[PDB]
Amino acid sequence: AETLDPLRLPLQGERLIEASAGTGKTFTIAALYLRLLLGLGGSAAFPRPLTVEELLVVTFTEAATAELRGRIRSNIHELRIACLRETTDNPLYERLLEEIDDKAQAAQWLLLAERQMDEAAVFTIHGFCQRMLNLNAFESGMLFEQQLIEDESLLRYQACADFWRRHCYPLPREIAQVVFETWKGPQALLRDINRYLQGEAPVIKAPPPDDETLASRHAQIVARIDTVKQQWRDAVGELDALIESSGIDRRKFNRSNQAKWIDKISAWAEEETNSYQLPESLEKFTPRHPLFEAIDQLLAEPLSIRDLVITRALAEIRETVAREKRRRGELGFDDMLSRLDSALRSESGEVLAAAIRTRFPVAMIDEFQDTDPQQYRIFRRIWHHQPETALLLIGDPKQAIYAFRGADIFTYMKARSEVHAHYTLDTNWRSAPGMVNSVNKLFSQTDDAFMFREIPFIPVKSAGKNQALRFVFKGETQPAMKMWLMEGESCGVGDYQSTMAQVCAAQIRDWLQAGQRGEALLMNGDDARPVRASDISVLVRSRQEAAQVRDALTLLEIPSVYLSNRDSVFETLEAQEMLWLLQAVMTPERENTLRSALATSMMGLNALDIETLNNDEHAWDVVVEEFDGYRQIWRKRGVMPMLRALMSARNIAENLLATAGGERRLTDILHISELLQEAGTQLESEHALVRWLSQHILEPDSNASSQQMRLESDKHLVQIVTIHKSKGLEYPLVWLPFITNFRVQEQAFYHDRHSFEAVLDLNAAPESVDLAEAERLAEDLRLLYVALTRSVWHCSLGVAPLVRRRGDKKGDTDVHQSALGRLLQKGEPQDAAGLRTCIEALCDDDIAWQTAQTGDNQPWQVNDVSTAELNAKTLQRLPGDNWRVTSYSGLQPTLTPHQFPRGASPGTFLHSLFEDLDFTQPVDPNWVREKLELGGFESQWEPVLTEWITAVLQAPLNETGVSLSQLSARNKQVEMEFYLPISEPLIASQLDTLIRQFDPLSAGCPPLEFMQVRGMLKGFIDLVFRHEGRYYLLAYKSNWLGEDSSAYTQQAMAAAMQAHRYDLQYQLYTLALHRYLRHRIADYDYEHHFGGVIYLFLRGVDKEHPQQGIYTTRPNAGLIALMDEMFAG
Template sequence: MLSLNAFESGMLFEQQLIEDESLLRYQACADFWRRHCYPLPRDIAQVVFDVWKGPKALLKDIDRYLQGEAPVIKAPPSQEETLASRHEQILARINQVKQQWCEAVSELEALFESSGIDRRKFNRGNQAKWIEKITAWAQEEAKNYQLPEALGKFSQRFLDERTKAGGVTPRHPLFVAIDNLLSEPLSIKDLVLTRALSEIRETVAQEKRRRGELGFDDMLSRLDAALRSESGEALAAAIRTRFPVAMIDEFQDTDPQQYRIFRRIWRHQPDTALLLIGDPKQAIYAFRGADIFTYMKARSEVSAHYTLDTNWRSAPGMVNSVNKLFSQMNDAFMFRDIPFSPVKFAQRNQSLQFKVNDVPQPAMTLWLMEGESCGSGDYQSYMAQVCATQIRDWLRAGQTGDALLMNGDASRPVRASDISVLVRSRREAALIRDALTLLAIPSVYLSNRDSVFETLEAQEMLWVLQAVMAPERENTLRSALATSMMGLTALDIETLNNDENAWDAVVEEFDGYRQMWHKRGVMPMLRALMSARNIAENLLATAGGERRLTDILHISELLQEAGSQLESEHALVRWLAQHILEPDSNASSQQLRLESDKHLVQIVTIHKSKGLEYSLVWLPFITHFPRAGSGFLSR
């Protein structure tokens, strides 16, 4: 739109679109780090380092806010405040409490003895240990923001909760001072983030202007600004003339800026149509700036609402179960502007069923853990075990023809690939994979975004390449032979050590790989080594071998690609070592590839499962969710 209407939009004709701004943002972040962190005194630099180890860690915290419209800081720090002044203020607060503690510690034992403190929750033995640890801390001058874990036991709020009903609560100005100290964060984080956001965004913008470049976010920002300028109506009219009808799919994932653009061009315009298609329950791109309130605002501004009333995928029992579950509350999705609308099932799915031992299974089953309450760790362990056990029982029944997926007169046994487990995170996925592995059930995590350079295979590949490059170095060669991909035992290696002829043969073998690498490249050399050492066969014979072989082949391809651009074998080894030290999981080329998902239970995040379809689905941790932090940023 900008280039087609360059005159109305004020768009420069000679500008280049850049699809990936990540390198620009990193360079700007590194510049910020050099300007502000390098000159810091050692004590303040250590405080910053305790939060972020370097510019890459800082960028990870703010990257989402460097894209799209600038975020609003809820409670911005004063422009005059510096890291040094904040640091001194925090240390002064800590030292004040330390001084009060040293002055009052001799009074505490008598104070607690004369109070109604519940000794079952605040016993004398622990009390003495806590006082001893805090006293040792209080006698040293504060140099960092670390507080003893036990300090919170002496806050007035905590002591109020630990006093017996009707008893005398221990009270002292020290306890109130501890309350006040703990109530406000002892951190420079908000100060650094606020400055970083402002300066890095400006640095990136300046660099793009200097280069004559713009990104996707810039196009939106410029179109938004152009539509609000003096020539905005002419630009909107030109766009409407070219596109009188606009159909916006997945509208729930739009942000306020995008909606302003649509609204400015098409709303209340004769002979035009603006169709907004979306489902707020599927809003998944909040991390990119999408705003569910934008959807709600748009919905309230449009009088004509049309709803799809038929589920074409699911069995009747599943559709009815979902209708029943979400009809239990008036505001099932928290906001009245997002109502739940029951749907019908498709007649073609009338005969879809899951039978075990010839008994139709409920479309939806809710598992309840026994007992009144439990910790989140116990809950997750229990549900992972229940989930894995249920899947094992289904698969066993499928092997004997007793667990069948029915569709009319047709039926087939349940297979592992029919089953999906939905999770929220990599950690939850690991819990399920571990539970399934204990029962010898193979699985695959479809949402894995780890870098292949973070794997054991990457480190082992480095040792192998180092050995190929210098097989005459015994320690280097021995390290390569000891890798798990080689499949040798400690006894095998010891036998080689004691047999000079056998060892010389291995040295000669690896020298041959070195010559092949030099003449033909790294990939042919690795293929020859893998063939001679039966690496693929050995790995596939072990648990998780397919995953490991996939990673080895992936790393081999990346090495071949990098090798074509580097001047020597030594440079390629340095390249691999550097990528192991600093893997980048955001680089698509590095992300772990999927090993074959044939005959595997599929584990996938709820986010990634959108639009996918599975016969049998487990949500083992659906009642466990992280508490959202209040944060200090908002869009």
């Protein structure tokens, strides 16, 4: 490999950047981004400068893409400032400024980059795949709009249930017994094949043929057993083998067991006594007959139906999932990768890749260790050897720890074998040089410590500015790596975990006890820093040992937070308490739910309080009354107002904050409240939110929003973080108590060392088990490197002679089967004394060891201090006056029109019919039929409806007898919308007396009550029409439910006007028309131009009665001026 310079990297063809742990990878990506933007390098430069919309940056984590985009934006702004000023404070920026000859054009390009940074092409893998599928949808064959699903386990379980229904149900008993012996149900099969159903489907070594069913395999195994049974029945009754000292004389009794074995062929599991009839075992303890050879041939391979069912499940379930998502039109995360791979797999889609070469003729791919083989197949399809495009694979083979998710280091080894150039970062800027020397001493004991030929380890170099980092104790300077060797010959797993957790808790309380007195310090040159609780971090691998560390640390009065906690908030007790509280609020009549909800830990009541509440009936009456008030707030204001009034009236937030350990409970309660308020806005029903909360309690599925957050950030806490969640982070002091714990992989799923493809061996072959255990050991070594390279000042390791075998004292330990023992014992099996000598052999100034001492003196010292005085501001006056823009509604034989259905919707339909119809043109019956078809009413009403409409239109409504047909299109104006201002507070008592002074219809009609309205008033006049130089207003009313006979006289219409309170609406209409005619026509007189107001009752118009149906009223011409003076000011 070669060293990497950011200003000397040739951006041509494919380049592979190997950025080690702790190196400035995020700085190098920004430097290469500035190099691609400005076009620097000279001979090794790009042929043309590229814009922001042509630079493609690929990083998997979305927060990493956001942080990288912000860092690139800050670097763009800093380089623009340094180019405008021709000076800088950074040496790499100094060389960047020295490489360019022109300053104005580079500054203009950086300004354009700063302006176009919003349209930057910095996306994720699946985001870039979705953008390429949506953009060039023709060559791929993708829908323009689709619905992404976050969880795919439900459809996968449905397809597995469909496979179990269509495969396991019609089987007979002799096959279903073996199917039940393999798996209990489809859930165990789904748990087996869940790592293979997602992502790329692997290649099965020696698959069954497509015509072989379960019955054919069962009959083949039955015939294979029956041949051995026939050969045992033919060769029975004889014994010619020599009697050995190991061979007991009871073996014929075992043969008698075989005499009890050959009864029927309905069974599947043979006897163990056939293991006594093996020629390889009888010779080691003389076999002449080939019956022993046939028995050994029968026991050579396992008689299992499991592989055929697994192959049929992998062929059927994925196809059913794809069929269901193609029918529903949904898409998944890996479905974008599969669609892009199938698009580039086609003939025309290669030209689509050329369009991608038209789109982005460059690629900088970060985190190449977490790369699926479909992703590398796509990147080889686009950017293999084409000119003018550059490929920069920035990654680290020593950090590939996501093999469970879908990543594969063999794809990275294939990529390293395909490319020619290799570049590495020599300088390490994170850790102290002692930790760097400890890592370079531990990992370079033997050659190829990562056990793969394509993953080489290099000695890294520390930083010059961080060469004085020292973690000092009270006694002397503490070394970098301190391998705490647990004393003993052989120990278990749980006892070793408990002792190392106690040793780690003792070290934490010793570093925190001496840290608060200025004894243990972190020193950078002359600067010193005390060690707080947030500096020490414990690196674990699973959740059980994390809970063990948390319990062993809270036993010594030390609070610890879990950063890797992905548990849902709906699975705790607080969700059940919120459900009980919502059930008590929704149903407060039954006292059982209210009594069960009041005694929860959220309310904080004692047993004596519950007893006195059950004894005193008046206190329970007050409780029921305030819970009914909470229900009224919940129905009128929402979820969060009810919860805030409950937390303010009961004062449970102050009680939870005063309680030690209740802050996490209060944050979980607030998060559950926020989720309930988010889910309650989309549901109009009140019980639907309670059912949704009960469903999310019963559904333990984890979303991005429904996880637990950090309880506090101000108080320093010991942070527990897993090895996968510690990638890219930084910790001062790191403790690794369970770095010696390993796990043996049972399933045979490996990768070929030549073709670099995934090979799944369903048979129990030991070669596939060893080839999978080699990849497991490589993954454990990568996890060991990731967990070791996060410490800055000090790392501590827990070494112990752990024996995975159940034997107590066998003379050998299994530390060589772990990742740490392969580097300590140099890949050789040794003992506890051998492990101790291997620890004591590599002893330097940075690497030391000590024994594990169990002991406790005192938990901690709180050293509390009094809180500062504070108060809350109070609003002196009202936030705003009563300003509201309202309307009139806010201030308040067989076919006949009498038999018409009375409602708001038929009234609006008749209003739309009178609005859309032209008054000059005659009414056409087919138009009325088309309008009734568009509205959806009955077709039989139409010939009565058109003659009723013509009878209404023929009837004149005026004091002179003017009909509606005499009004031209210029004279009419339908649905005039007006806004009326008012600056005075509208008092009802000062307005109703002024109305009653002039309006004769206000003899009865007691006044309505409405608040002071200051602002605008909306209104919609139905019709305004002029005739012979005189304006007229016309409104329509069409409810008329209570009349069927001819009783709609002027008295009944006046009673309807007094009851429905249309007098105020008509007076505001006259005021609006007066103001409009005053504003429009100059020299306007109210008596000369205005003529009157007409109300039209549609169901009251008769052919013989011209007065019935219409209602003409004219004001006294004195109320209008006083109302204008009142509304004006």
